Structure 1
Amino acid sequence: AAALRAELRDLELEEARLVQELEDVDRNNARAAADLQAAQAEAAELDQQERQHYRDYSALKRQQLELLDQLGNVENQLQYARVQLDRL
């Protein structure tokens, strides 16, 4: 009886100690999670910016290709007209 009470008190002390250490570690987990989520948010904000530069870069590349095509068509007309005039 006495020994069982003694063991039980010892166990309940260890329970309360582990509970408390778990409260401290759960608080620490929380801060680390908040800091991870902050870093994730920063990466998402940067990503929005990155995508916008990518859309600019693509749009400008598309517009360069279109202008190059236009220039080639003009150049075909130019070479045709030069042939016509050289024959005269």
Structure 2
Amino acid sequence: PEAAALRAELRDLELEEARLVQELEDVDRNNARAAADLQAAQAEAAELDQQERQHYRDYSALKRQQLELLDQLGNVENQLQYARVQRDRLK
């Protein structure tokens, strides 16, 4: 009967562990799925990053283009102001 209580505890105990195994399997499933979604999102973000960098680069190139045009303008304006002074003296 000692082994009588035992046999009962084992029964309830093995049931507990099976219930716990069931819960673990649900949680592990949802965990793996969350990791997959994560990885999918990271891959999307990388591809995007690639495109974003390209955009940044294009914009930056255009920017250097404008600054070069601005410098030229200022070189011309320097010459222009000189010639303007020279014209004004004639008067």
TM bucket by the smaller chain?
0.7 to 0.9
What residue ranges of structure 2 are gaps of 5+ in the alignment? none
Corresponding residue for residue 52 of structure 1: 54
CA distance in 2, matches of 1:2, 1:66: 95
CA distance in 1, matches of 2:34, 2:72: 57
CA distance in 2, matches of 1:74, 1:5: 102
CA distance in 1, matches of 2:20, 2:83: 92
Root-mean-square deviation (CA, aligned residues, Å) is 1.4
What residue ranges of structure 1 are gaps of 5+ in the alignment? none
Instruction: Provide the TM-score with structure 1 as the length reference.
Output: 0.86
Shift of 1:31: 1.2
Instruction: Provide the TM-score with structure 2 as the length reference.
Output: 0.84
Residue-pair matches, total: 88
Instruction: Summarize deviations over 1:21-56 as a string: whole Å, max 9, x none.
Output: 212321121112101211121122112111111111
Which portions of structure 1, spanning 4 or more consecutive aligned residues, are displaced by more than 4 angstroms?
none
CA distance in 2, matches of 1:28, 1:57: 43
Instruction: Summarize deviations over 1:49-81 as a string: whole Å, max 9, x none.
Output: 111111111111122112101110111011102
